[PDB]
């Protein structure tokens, strides 16, 4: 119930629109790391993919999550940018 106190639960990478706007296709992997910092999650199963999840769960308000997915090629060059701002 709403009477039970709950602390805030934060998960993932801290994302700001200014930081996300600096990513371009063709950027090097280290350049992306410089722009955003290290991603806390990545594909373990054989693809060069980075996941930036910006998830905030307030005590009783609904959760919000932004997901930015970056796919690099075999050489480490960014090839696809996927941004889901909500849900």
């Amino acid at each position: 119930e709403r009477v039970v106190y709950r602390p805030d639960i934060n998960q993932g990478n801290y994302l700001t629109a200014n930081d996300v706007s600096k990513i371009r296709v063709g950027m090097t992997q280290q350049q992306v790391a410089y722009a955003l910092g290290t991603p806390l999650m990545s594909d373990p199963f054989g693809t060069n993919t980075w996941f930036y999840v910006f998830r905030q769960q307030p005590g009783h308000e609904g959760v919000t999550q932004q997901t930015l997915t970056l796919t690099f090629n075999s050489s480490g060059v960014l090839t696809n940018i996927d941004n889901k701002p909500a849900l």
Binding site: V4, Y5, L40
Partner: protein, 785 residues
């Protein structure tokens, strides 16, 4: 001339093989006089030989040598001012130790090396001497004697300059002292080197806090008297002028938090310069950045001085750096507790951006638990990463159980046995478990309690209680007093914020009373319940079934569980009877405890403690007398016997049941009783108020490593219990038990020890304000709580 073969004499344990390895010459070698001289010189140089001499034949040479004795043991005597371990370490570091040999001349150097130790410690007149005793085997036992001399004392601390402040005011803050007040039992004038540096820095800080930005200490001199009993310390200074801070400019990489830092660096016009204030500003900027995840910012403040205007311009350069992330949270030292019992307390998450305040909150929540003696936290940068850290909490576990066992007085009522175990962290699972029992010729008692504080992940608590009580005055049904009771409680608790929680629960109680002695208060209650027993006899019985709704609230912000030094705790508990119960009443009780540290190290602490209780019947009924409050004892007022404070029973003249002479009876008509008789038997009341003031001090003789296990205190206790329904008009000739103003007071000393069996409490108190019928108990001992 040739060395036909190696020959040696007089040696027993020195190997001839190593000797052959060592000297310039060995078996079969052609040798000459110069080589012989070199060989004997080398044999002398071996160190482990005392002296060497040689026999030369026409064709070959032979040598004989004496072994140097090895040290069998090292012993010390005297050295009252300093115990033996570091002396042993210094002596061994000087090149002499057990299992190795020494020359007689080495004592001349060992004595100087040892006297230098006392010279450094502060005893310049000390002297040392040593003696060696031979063993039956070729070994020496070393006896060493210290004649430690008079310790030197500080004669004067003089400051040259210091036109702005007097010397006494300046040196009042120093740790060194040249004069001691009459009333000091501790503290001494004895000089110490590294303490002087701290006092010099204290002088620096004193002047820097008053705006003397260009203060410097020119030089300091320490000198001895010719007899080496006195010490003189002189400090030369140039204080200069005092400057007022013109303004603060902040620049660099603010990471978007410029406004907050500008608020942190705000100043009023014309304020004097102050070093500690700018240091606080820097630390506050670091703290502010730390909340947003900037763990390693660069903060540097550079003051710029105007010579003519005598004002300070302050430049602060800030670089926030990167925002850091928590990769792992680790726990070390939890050999008994589950990982989850500690992880549930965390406010910082794994796999999220760092918040330093969240880490601090987790540390504080761990300290508040009481399961650990110490808690430390370390933020370790992940090697090879620019922006990731691991957070490690290091704990030491402590005994959370208590074993309360005791034996009652062997009076005519027979031996009484009491036992019980209370455990807060059962098997490291976080469950609270308690078992209590008591066996007496009259009474058999049992109680069981189990609580799980984390019935849900959010900290909802669930727990229950069972108890059984049975008092029989005699082993027969021949109209003797009996009191049987049992019941159940179940409670649900949940938090409402970081520091506050609420409770709700249900309870059942059975009570069965038989053959009560007629007395005023019990029988006023019995009339309130609609019973009309006869006051002239003990043939009576009363039975009730009760259901209550339980409610509670607790505030807790203590700095740690077992020996608090800061914060306070407030607990509220209450009951109300559910419709359908036999009794109809409410009852509420309030507990508070507040700790105020009067010391930077929290060694001197003032504790304020209070207790309150009030209950009353709801309909025409009254509150049952078995729910009454009691006062007196180690829990409430230490100078008084347990439950003695408060109203006393008034008995009616009645025929005693199971009567036999050679027994004491109250208002027994068999003994000729004819009127109401006043007694000392405490009966409790429906209103209660207790307050205590305590002063917590360091323990005089316990060492630092054991200081956390002992607490000593001086206390002032006061309390009172009274009956709000006592009708003083009907009973004018007896004490007015409705008056709340009969305050008992006591004072004494208490000592708390965290023993292997749990906390032990010893106290001695003098109850210097008493009332009629109060029973004193000056010495008290208790287990648990």
């Amino acid at each position: 001339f040739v060395v036909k073969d190696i020959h040696f004499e007089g040696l027993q344990r020195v190997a001839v093989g190593a000797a052959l390895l060592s000297m310039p010459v060995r078996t079969g070698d052609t040798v000459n006089d110069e080589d012989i001289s070199n060989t004997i010189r080398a044999l002398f140089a071996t160190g482990n030989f005392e002296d060497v001499r040689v026999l030369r034949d026409g064709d070959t040479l032979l040598v004989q040598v004496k072994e140097r004795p090895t040290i069998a043991s090292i012993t010390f005597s005297g050295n009252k001012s300093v115990k033996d371990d570091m002396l042993k370490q210094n002596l061994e570091a000087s090149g002499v130790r057990v299992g190795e040999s020494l020359d007689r001349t080495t004592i001349a150097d060992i004595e100087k090396g040892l006297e230098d130790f006392y010279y450094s410690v502060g005893k310049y007149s000390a002297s040392v001497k040593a003696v060696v005793t031979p063993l039956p085997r070729n070994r020496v036992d070393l006896k060493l004697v210290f004649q430690e001399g008079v310790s030197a004392e500080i004669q004067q601390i003089n400051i040259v300059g210091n036109h702005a402040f007097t010397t006494d005011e300046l040196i009042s803050h120093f740790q060194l002292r040249d004069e001691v007040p009459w009333w000091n039992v501790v503290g001494d004038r004895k000089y110490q080197k590294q303490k002087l540096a701290g006092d010099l820095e204290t002088l620096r800080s004193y002047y820097l806090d008053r705006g003397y930005a260009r203060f410097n200490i020119d030089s300091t001199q320490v000198s001895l008297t010719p007899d080496k009993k006195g010490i003189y310390v002189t400090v030369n200074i140039t204080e200069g002028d005092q400057y007022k801070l013109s303004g603060v400019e902040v620049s660099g990489n603010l990471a978007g938090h410029s406004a907050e830092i500008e608020q942190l660096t705000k100043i009023e016009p014309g304020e004097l310069y102050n070093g500690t204030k700018v240091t606080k500003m820097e630390d506050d900027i670091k703290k502010l950045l730390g909340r947003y995840g900037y763990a390693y910012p660069r903060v540097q403040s550079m003051p710029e001085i105007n010579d003519a205007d005598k004002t300070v311009k302050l430049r602060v350069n800030v670089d926030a750096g990167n925002r850091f992330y928590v990769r792992k949270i680790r726990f070390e030292g939890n050999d008994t507790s589950k990982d989850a019992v500690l992880r549930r307390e965390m406010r910082q998450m794994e796999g999220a951006w760092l918040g330093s305040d969240l880490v601090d909150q987790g540390k504080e929540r761990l300290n508040r638990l009481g399961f650990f003696e110490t808690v430390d936290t370390d933020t370790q940068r992940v090697p090879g990463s620019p922006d990731q850290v691991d957070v490690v909490y290091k704990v030491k576990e402590r005994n959370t159980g208590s074993f309360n066992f005791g034996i009652g007085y062997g009076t005519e009522s027979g031996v009484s046995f009491q036992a019980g175990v209370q455990q807060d962290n059962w098997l490291g699972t976080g469950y609270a478990v308690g078992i209590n029992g008591t066996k007496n010729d009259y009474q058999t008692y049992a109680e069981l309690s189990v609580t799980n504080p984390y019935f849900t992940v959010d900290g909802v608590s669930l727990g229950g209680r069972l108890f059984y009580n049975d008092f029989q005055a005699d082993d027969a049904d021949l109209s003797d007093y009996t009191n049987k009771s049992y019941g159940t409680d179940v409670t649900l608790g949940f938090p409402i914020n970081e520091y506050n929680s609420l409770r709700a629960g249900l309870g059942y109680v059975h009570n069965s009373l038989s053959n009560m002695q007629p007395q005023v208060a019990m029988w006023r209650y019995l009339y309130s319940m609609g019973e009309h027993p006869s006051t002239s006899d003990q043939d009576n019985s009363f039975k009730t079934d009760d259901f209550t709704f339980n409610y509670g609230w607790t505030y807790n912000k203590l700095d740690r569980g077992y020996f608090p030094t800061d914060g306070s705790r407030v607990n509220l508990t209450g009951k109300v009877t559910i419709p359908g119960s036999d009794n109809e009443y409410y009852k509420v009780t309030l507990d508070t405890a507040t700790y105020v540290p009067i010391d930077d190290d929290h060694k001197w602490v003032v504790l304020g403690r209070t207790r309150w209780g009030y209950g009353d019947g709801l309909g025409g009924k009254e509150m049952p007398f078995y729910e009454n409050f009691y006062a007196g004892g180690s829990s409430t007022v230490r100078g008084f016997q347990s439950n003695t404070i408060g109203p006393k029973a008034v008995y009616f003249p009645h025929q005693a049941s199971n009567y036999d002479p050679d027994y004491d009876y109250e208002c027994a008509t068999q003994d000729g009783a004819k009127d109401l008789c006043k007694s000392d038997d405490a009966v409790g009341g429906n209103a209660m108020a207790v307050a205590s003031l305590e002063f917590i001090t360091p323990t005089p003789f316990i060492s630092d490593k054991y200081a956390n296990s002992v607490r000593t205190s001086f206390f002032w206790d006061m309390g009172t219990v009274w009956d709000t329904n006592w009708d003083s008009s009907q009973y004018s000739g007896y004490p007015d038990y409705s008056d709340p103003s009969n305050i008992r007071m006591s004072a004494g000393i208490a000592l708390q020890w965290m023993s292997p069996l749990g906390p032990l409490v010893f106290s001695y108190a003098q109850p210097f304000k008493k009332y009629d019928g109060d029973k004193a108990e000056q010495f008290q001992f208790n287990i648990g709580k």
